[PDB]
RNA sequence: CGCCACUUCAUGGAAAUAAAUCACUCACGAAUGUCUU
């Protein structure tokens, strides 16, 4: 799986919107795979990876063109999942 | 370090329940038991 952030950036670049960044979106794990296009045979497998560690409402992408930014809104695609508490609990004792 | 907010604003249960439903007193008292022609 590749996180939805990768395809969010790719879709926005597919339109006449250019995003701020010196490095291309990261693909895979290797040290330098900053690529904009999927490998070759077919597109990567994508999923909403960041949901399992806490559901958000908006994704802000902050276009390079100043004083304007792109907002991606997350909705449950049928009103079933409105929130999700993070499943990790941090504890501080002594 | 800079920049930046969205979301949620009541449902479910109880909506009357028991006790007393008339009680006591008086239930006839006194006069007349024939009178006047």
Automatic annotation (TrEMBL):
Protein's recorded name = Uncharacterized protein
Q: Which organism is it from?
A: Bacteroides fragilis
Q: Which residues of the full protein are shown?
A: 283 to 376 of 469
């Amino acid at each position: 799986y590749r996180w939805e952030k990768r395809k969010m950036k790719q879709l926005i670049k597919a339109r006449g919107y250019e995003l701020k960044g010196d490095h291309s979106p990261i693909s895979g794990i290797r040290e330098n795979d900053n690529s904009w296009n999927d490998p070759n045979p077919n597109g990567y497998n994508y999923a909403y990876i960041r949901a399992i560690l806490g559901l958000a409402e908006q994704y802000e992408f902050q276009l390079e063109t100043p004083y304007q930014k792109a907002i991606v809104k997350i909705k449950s695609a049928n009103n079933c999942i409105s929130r999700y508490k993070s499943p990790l609990l941090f504890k501080i004792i002594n």
